[PDB]
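ok posting inputs for the 8-azaxanthine job
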Amino acid sequence: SAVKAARYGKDNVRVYKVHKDEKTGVQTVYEMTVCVLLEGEIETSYTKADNSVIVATDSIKNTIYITAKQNPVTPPELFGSILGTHFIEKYNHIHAAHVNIVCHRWTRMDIDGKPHPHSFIRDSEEKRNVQVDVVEGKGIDIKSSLSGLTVLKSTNSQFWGFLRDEYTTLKETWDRILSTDVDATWQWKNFSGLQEVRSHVPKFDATWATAREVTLKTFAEDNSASVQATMYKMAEQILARQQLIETVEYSLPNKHYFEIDLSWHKGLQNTGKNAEVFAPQSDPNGLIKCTVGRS
Amino acid sequence: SAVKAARYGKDNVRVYKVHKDEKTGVQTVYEMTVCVLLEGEIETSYTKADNSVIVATDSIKNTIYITAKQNPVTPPELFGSILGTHFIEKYNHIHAAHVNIVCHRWTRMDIDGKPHPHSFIRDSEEKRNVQVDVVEGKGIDIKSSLSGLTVLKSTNSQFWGFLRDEYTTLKETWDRILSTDVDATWQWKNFSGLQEVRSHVPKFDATWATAREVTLKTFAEDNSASVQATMYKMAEQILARQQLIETVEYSLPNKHYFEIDLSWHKGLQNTGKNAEVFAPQSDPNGLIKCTVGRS
Amino acid sequence: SAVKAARYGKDNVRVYKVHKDEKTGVQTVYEMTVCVLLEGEIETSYTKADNSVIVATDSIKNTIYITAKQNPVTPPELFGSILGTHFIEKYNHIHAAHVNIVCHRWTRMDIDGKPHPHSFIRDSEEKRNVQVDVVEGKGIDIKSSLSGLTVLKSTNSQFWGFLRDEYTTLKETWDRILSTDVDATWQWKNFSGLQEVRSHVPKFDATWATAREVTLKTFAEDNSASVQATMYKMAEQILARQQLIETVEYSLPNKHYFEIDLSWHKGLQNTGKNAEVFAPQSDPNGLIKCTVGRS
Amino acid sequence: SAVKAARYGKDNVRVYKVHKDEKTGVQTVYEMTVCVLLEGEIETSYTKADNSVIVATDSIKNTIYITAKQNPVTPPELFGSILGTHFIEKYNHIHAAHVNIVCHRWTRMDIDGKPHPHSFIRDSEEKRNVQVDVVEGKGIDIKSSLSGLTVLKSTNSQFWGFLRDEYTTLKETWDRILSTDVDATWQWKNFSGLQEVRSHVPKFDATWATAREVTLKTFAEDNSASVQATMYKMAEQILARQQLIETVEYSLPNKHYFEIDLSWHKGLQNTGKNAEVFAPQSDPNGLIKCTVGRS
Ligand SMILES: O=c1[nH]c(=O)c2nn[nH]c2[nH]1
Ligand SMILES: O=c1[nH]c(=O)c2nn[nH]c2[nH]1
Ligand SMILES: O=c1[nH]c(=O)c2nn[nH]c2[nH]1
Ligand SMILES: O=c1[nH]c(=O)c2nn[nH]c2[nH]1
Ligand code: NA
Ligand code: NA
Ligand code: NA
Ligand code: NA
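and the output
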């Protein structure tokens, strides 16, 4: 036998950073969970008990904190690029660094109608993420995403005209609830290195904002023919509004809300146009995916 | 042996309800998770296999949906009171109904600066809850709460002057991070029945709003001497602003953020006034509780 | 306003301890999660920013580790008693210590038919717990429990003869699946102090073993008339087999498995005596409780 | 823009099946969570609101239950192959079916030293899984795995000789705790279709058993130089004992247990050879991966 693939590092590194404005007194906080996995000429640590090739995962942890101290942690695309570049430049035998960052929300509080200088609220478990792959000789590959964006619309969702055969019991509908947890990823053009990533820094926050806005507006406004049709409209718009993105991926659960027939009880009408009370279904769920690129 | 206590019913009943405005077209959604447990002359179901005294938990589930169809589900204090009253009035041998409701957030979306008539976002896993205990001959006892309100302030928290002995290693501080998940409960004066609960209906949403506002403003603005001192200020204000509340309870974790000494690496200064990067601690956590009443 | 109740301390303290046998080489591991909350003359920490009365939660954490180093951590009833007694004896103004311990499973591995001296497996997330309340002048109150014991029987469960009215749709059955997560608590006679707790130490492991054995055998062998009837049989047996227990409490979810009618598809028969494939329901669930004492 | 990739179906389908032995009365239960995602000529459902190409996810759910009724659900490799083959054979425009199965443990109870005919216990949240990819023209690709196997050894783990530089603070050790959650995958040789999968059916349970046994014995017995070195030994053995496997993948967290220096308290010695009480760390964790193939 032989090693065909190997990567290792530190997962679940929680990181907080505060920025304190000298002039205004305004403080801004950032909180992340970071994973860094390394590849390189490390197979002998597996096959020969050769630990000399291992940058200790504990050291990778130290390096995450040191890099956060000495560099911006925002946008996460930049921080991940800096972090990944460090490992492949510092260690001759390390040839790839894979950096995953989950950003947690700390939204500035409004108190009596005014923004507070140092108090924050976790307004939802929605995350902003990056996957940054820094590979020697292949530049920097960045996937940006938002996830855990949970939404519901109470009407203007339809699903009819699907295939019907002997396995089919689902009734066609022209008015249903649609609810999902949005997981949306945009994949950037390859960057040649840190200089090029830095040259595009404003685009990262801007494109995240675009992706989120397009998602919410399209969800709210599309009289949806299916999850498939709606998610495609989101993707196509995002591609049209940032040329440095090559693809957009959506993964959407269809979190079903079932009508409840109550007519067995005193002829109570609670279906169709009379449907008011529904049973949210924890499982199973439709799962719909696509990757959209340029034609 | 003998039955000393018994209660039973249905837990984790997910409920959605939509209200559709005939005139404006605006839709409003409500989503809850409901538990109803009953007490009464039911001990023989345990001791003698006498199922004749059991209102099936499946029937309790049906009743939750039927009651939601025929009554307002908002405020949850009212819905719980109606639900609990139903069981003790309908069944001669049922003498108490214990109703727990967890309300999930579905906040109306703003699209292009305008509120959308039928699209919603889960803006955080913060919950609004009630515990409604309807007991024959003892009226209706309601505990209202908010929970999972997660907040952080980056300065203006202190902790010094605590007891120091041979078990103590904690250094005094005049500037630390304070973060918590707020669990706050206000206990209403006993209500004599549904008429009295209904007579106070506007107060339930209003007092929830007060509790939340006081929590956020006090957290943000108090130069905190301790979690103990700050949570007491919250409680005292809430009691002063709603006379129909008898007690306020807080349960607050102190979700620690530790400084990281990096001076071992190139003399990097990251402690005290130089502290920028911190290690959020998943565990353990301080846990601070109090119940505040009127003097 | 005034403080009506207050308690505070450290939650979620993870603790591991290893015992190494000098003579045999056999090692034994223990892992727990500990919470200690204190009460006493501490109200001024809430009302007057008086931290002088606060034994820091950080110090409580230190004390948990120190006590584990200097004392047995098994049985958890003993460790909790020692821990709680420490706080009320050490601190004049602390009058109660509330100690919760969750014990995690590390079962010795069998390798090639022989027990291994230092390798362990988490064989299930079933927990063994204690709640130990040490109150000055009121001795030591111990509640022992097992929880997260998940079981299923595929037949020999019935449920018929329950109340039927206009809210009822549940069909009577003489053969159903029964599955639950067992939460069972036995409450000990009050102990006067550490000497009396220590005098009964062998009974704690023995009674836990009895409770578990009775639970499993009764579940497996009872042709169950209801969850109510079966859980009562468990309790009554436990009380009969340990006289130092005053009450037994069970809390049992009925984790429903629904038949699936497939007759719409090629007349497939999958109900009643033909039922083979079922839909496990995540929610809702029946929830059945009782506390059984001596007659 | 254009669809570059698309797949959709039903996730989180919970399935129970009971087998009842006519002659012995012995019952055997199986419980799974199933996901089926389909690919094919379905892009117009995304681009043109063409639902005619969609086999409804609800219908996929029905099909899972019907297939479980009419076929063995064990071994999961077989069930997944049957399920996947159904979709690509039944639907001309569906060209791939991706089937994920998570198998849940229901281990037969032993009561009074004898196996019980119809009562079961969830002995751990360890799972047995398969990923079965059935692609028209490319046969059946099966990945089998075990996951959530949580283990700990209290000694005979070492980690020294790793790279040391200005980012390193980790001390070398010749005696530490090692704990992990095992995720192990074995990838089968491509199968040409159902006939070939069926021809190897006994090998699936046998190879799962081998993988588990090798994992546990190697973990217990290897005086470990690193997670890397130990996991490689596991893989190499598995490959040597089943020739129809092409690769073995391990993903192992290093779930750290930290020594606690208590010497600040009365000179208490709890480090090095005196280490008894440890602090289990929830995060961060080392994460070590490799894929091993034949040389
Ligand atoms: O939007 C939907 N897409 C689907 O593929 C589907 N299948 N059942 N319901 C559905 N809804
Ligand atoms: O606010 C605090 N209260 C406490 O009781 C405590 N103990 N350690 N740190 C603390 N902070
Ligand atoms: O055992 C049961 N007890 C109950 O109270 C009940 N209600 N529905 N099904 C039930 N099963
Ligand atoms: O087994 C280990 N492998 C590693 O790569 C490592 N890094 N820190 N500790 C470690 N232990
Ligand atoms: Na390199
Ligand atoms: Na009554
Ligand atoms: Na005392
Ligand atoms: Na096909």
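notes: Residues 1-295 of chain B form a domain with the Urate Oxidase fold (CATH 3.10.270.10). The first strand of chain B starts at residue 2 and ends at 20.
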